[PDB]
Structure 1
């Protein structure tokens, strides 16, 4: 997070001024890596 306080924000808004400030809420970045079997070779066959 990168919070910023706008000084006397309440006093300015009471006076009527409009106040805008950049913000960045806390995030959550994740990656799943799922193992997968690979059929490297398959040739013989049988009948059922």
Structure 2
């Protein structure tokens, strides 16, 4: 998280100031890896 304070923010607002600040709300980044089996060889077939 990247918090920033504009001093006496409410006093500035009461003065009528346009108050803005750059901000980055904290959050999550996730990478999931799941294995997989791959059929390397396959041939003999039969019918039933």
Say yes or no: TM over 0.5: yes
**Runs ≥4 in structure 1, deviation > 2 angstroms?**
none
How big is each residue's C-alpha offset from its partner over 1:13-46, in whole Å with a ceiling of 9 and x where there is no partner? 0011111001001111111111111001101111
TM-score scaled by length of structure 1: 0.90
Can you give the 5+ residue segments of structure 1 that lack an aligned partner in the other structure?
none
Give the CA RMSD over aligned residues.
0.7
Can you give the 5+ residue segments of structure 2 that lack an aligned partner in the other structure?
none
Aligned length: 48
TM-score scaled by length of structure 2: 0.90
